[PDB]
Design a protein around this ligand. Sequence first.
Ligand SMILES: CCCCCCCCCCCCCCCCCC(=O)OC[C@H](COP(=O)([O-])OCC[N+](C)(C)C)OC(=O)CCCCCCCCCCCCCCCCC
Ligand SMILES: CCCCCCCCCCCC(=O)OC[C@H](COP(=O)(O)OCC[N+](C)(C)C)OC(=O)CCCCCCCCCCC
Ligand code: SF4
Ligand code: SF4
Ligand code: SF4
Lengths: 102, 315, 179, 176, 156, 46
Amino acid sequence: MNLMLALLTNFTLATLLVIIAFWLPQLNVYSEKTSLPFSMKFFLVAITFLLFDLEIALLLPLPWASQTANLNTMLTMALFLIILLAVSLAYEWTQKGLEWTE
Amino acid sequence: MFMINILMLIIPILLAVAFLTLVERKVLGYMQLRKGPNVVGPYGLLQPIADAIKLFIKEPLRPATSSASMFILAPIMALGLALTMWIPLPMPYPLINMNLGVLFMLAMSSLAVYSILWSGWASNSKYALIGALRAVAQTISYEVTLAIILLSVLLMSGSFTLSTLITTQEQMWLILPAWPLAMMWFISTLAETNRAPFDLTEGESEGFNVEYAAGPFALFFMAEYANIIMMNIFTAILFLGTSHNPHMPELYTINFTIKSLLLTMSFLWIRASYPRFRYDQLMHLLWKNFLPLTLALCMWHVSLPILTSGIPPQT
Amino acid sequence: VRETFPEATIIKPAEIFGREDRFLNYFANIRWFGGVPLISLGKKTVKQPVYIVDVTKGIINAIKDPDARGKTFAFVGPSRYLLFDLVQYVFAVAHRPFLPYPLPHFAYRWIGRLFEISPFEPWTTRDKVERIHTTDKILPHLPGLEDLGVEATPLELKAIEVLRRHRTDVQPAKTIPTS
Amino acid sequence: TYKYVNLREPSMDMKSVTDRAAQTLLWTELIRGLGMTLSYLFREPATINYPFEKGPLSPRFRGEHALRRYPSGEERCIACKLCEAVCPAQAITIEAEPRADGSRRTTRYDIDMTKCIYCGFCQEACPVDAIVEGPNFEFSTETHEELLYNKEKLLNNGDKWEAEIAANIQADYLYR
Amino acid sequence: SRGEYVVAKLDDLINWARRSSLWPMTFGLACCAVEMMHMAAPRYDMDRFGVVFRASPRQSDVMIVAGTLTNKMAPALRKVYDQMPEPRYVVSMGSCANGGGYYHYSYSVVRGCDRIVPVDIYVPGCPPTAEALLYGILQLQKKIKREKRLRIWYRR
Amino acid sequence: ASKVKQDMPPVGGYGPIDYKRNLPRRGLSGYSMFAVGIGALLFGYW
Ligand SMILES: CCCCCCCCCCCCCCCCCC(=O)OC[C@H](COP(=O)([O-])OCC[N+](C)(C)C)OC(=O)CCCCCCCCCCCCCCCCC
Ligand SMILES: CCCCCCCCCCCC(=O)OC[C@H](COP(=O)(O)OCC[N+](C)(C)C)OC(=O)CCCCCCCCCCC
Ligand code: SF4
Ligand code: SF4
Ligand code: SF4
């Protein structure tokens, strides 16, 4: 109940400041003013982050995984995942995927 | 008593942000052989108040926006999440004692990237949207090292609780066994927060908030400066843990605060010393220097406790 | 004025339109509340708006012209319009959805009262509603712009320059023939 | 004679390669930069406390033009127009006639201070030290018309600044 | 007390804020921009008065026209002025921006920036010393301090 | 009937003025920077 009440305050306060910051200026009554080409490299960096992010999701439970009695199995699987994550980086690296020159 | 607790957290954060602008301007001035603000109030203490009043009574700038609803959503998200990342921090007792506090902070900081993205859309400027895409790409890229580096330090702590980092460091700061990670973690917080030498959004002759001027621009500024303090508070808890005496909690807060100020000052220290990276060069720093080393140190920090019999407790 | 300064020169213009006018910009700020309230439905109200530069050029030529002392002029536009047709044209040029609905004369007065309680420049008032819905008089016994060498500017020619800033091949409005 | 700025070969002995490896991995040269700005934090700043402190000037300083007098009050200017003929910006306008007592004096002496390039050629060309550039440099105005000086403004400046113009001329007339 | 007194203190507070946070946008067009840079240098340190070194045009409160304004550049300068959020002030620095200066009689020079934009302070010199420009910024602050926006509104 | 007096250098000239680059050599060697770095890790692991 505290967390729900904590999130409500932070965004309600942020909401109040945004609206008054939009309206408090609008009382000076100032004079009336009366006055992209797709890049495939930006997409590739966004996709690569996603696939690395999904690998990070699998690595997040490692602190709990080290409390098990099958450490020989757990350490093998943990290092396998991290290594395969390195292989992906090695693959993109060697295929000019990390470059920015057109 | 809890509602009073939230205000005892929110209000000082905004006052800390307010006077960080003053401290940043004087510190840069003295490293530049200048004085910085010293006229508006004694020693410039009233300079933040003058700027605040001036900004909030200046003419609105909002031009035609295609997603006016998205124009108002971005500052709310940016400032709502910036304050939300403080509630689990142990100082020494957290406002919301979470069992998964570390994951909560990663999750909330991975949503602040929407404020950048939504502000680019709501500006009706094809050259502002390109700037936002670059800013988004940099932020998500350095979120990869923050999570892997953070995961490597928790394998010595044993849980995602932020309060257990105090126990883990009761004999020794984690920086000593994990200074290679602290070096990369610290620079990631610079790139994550878009601070020099990584502030290519301020490449005046080389931002997505241009469509915000005064008012909402002031709110984006507060959110950004609130995250610098939070990141440097997170760094202190993670690598410079303070001793906690249950009968004298205020001793922790004094020592903890001093550490978090020095790290915040060092951000200003760095901004005064270096030129900034090209966009491709700060990407090559992450993908071709930090990520290879972070992955290698994650393998090492998974196997190290096992081979030394130093696996930490789950509880 | 005609008694204190007999040789004065009284100018009588209609609703002047221009970049900073309160006439075409007035029929473009009824979008944040709903449709377009009007006494009747804009019928039985005839308007003859005049361009701001025509009024300005007329006042200048009255200073230079000797045979304008002690005289009254009626600066009016070239064409006459119905308030419904005129307002429809304004929204078409400004690319705004036009949803006209009638509103009682007394009902328009009350919302005028609501908008005149503010301490700033009221958006609208009771008097403003009356003047917009007043029919522009036809005084053919007064010399107008043509008597000072000024060709009245049609509203269709120079309405885009005013309504360009309200936008997020337009048919000219139907006009009353001289008959 | 000449020198090469960037024509040195880095050593490849293992120690030097490791010295460069330490610099790359441990950021040693980036930490000297931090030391050089921490030094400046503890140096006294060069800022002065304007307007209570002023930046140093010299007797030759070229500031606001002004018209001078003899010790008797008579104007020094005898309407010769040498200053007008040498002004590169054509900022001086002079008209003259015989004064009531037969003297040769100006009826107009205007300087468009927005055309003037504050070069001092006029005070070089004047044979009687009439027009000078005083030491004043704080006469910013709020309208463009206040910078179009006529003979009254310039004579007022001379009476207003003579005490300081005379001492600046006395300090530097032997170099000119 | 009287309404004028109450609304006169609010005028002072907003006047104080606006002159204590004068953020300039410097149009550095010619040599006068060097002296503008010297006003930011350590000796004068304009940032100690609250005058930031260089703000973006959309965050700026005052425009410093420091240099020669040519016909080719005139429309660009007007556009930047039209995009400045209010309140906005213009400082004309040097003889070129004041009245054309050395190039007054040129075919390609605007004879004073006050033909394109309104000017609040004229700073004479070629170039004005960094101290003369600073004296002109402190005069603009004194000019903001004398504003009576709320008194005029109250007495309307 | 005094002597000529203009701005001249003092008899014997001015003192020497440095211009060559002076960036002093600081810090330890690469070997000793890694030895301290590795040693810090080992003590922390212990
Ligand atoms: C038995 C032991 C087993 C375990 C041992 C595990 C550790 C072994 C030692 C590992 C080496 C140490 C790694 C350090 C990180 C290296 C990152 C890297 O790639 O560097 C090269 C990178 C890239 O180097 P580069 O640009 O010259 O190019 C390298 C690659 N080539 C040459 C091919 C192009 O450099 C940087 O990271 C600099 C980033 C900019 C930094 C600007 C801010 C400086 C701020 C300085 C203060 C920092 C304080 C930090 C402390 C914070 C306290 C909380
Ligand atoms: C009740 C309505 C709220 C506003 C309250 C008044 C604040 C504005 C006055 C300060 C600026 C000013 O006055 O400038 C600085 C003044 C001197 O000004 P001066 O040269 O004598 O003014 C000359 C006349 N002018 C201004 C018309 C040209 O220094 C002072 O001694 C003020 C220091 C005390 C300020 C205490 C503030 C407490 C209020 C906090 C909550 C709002
Ligand atoms: S100082 Fe130069 S520009 Fe000014 S009046 Fe004298 S000659 Fe003309
Ligand atoms: S000021 Fe001097 S140079 Fe100029 S007209 Fe007078 S006497 Fe001649
Ligand atoms: S006024 Fe003088 S210094 Fe300034 S731009 Fe013109 S010539 Fe250059």
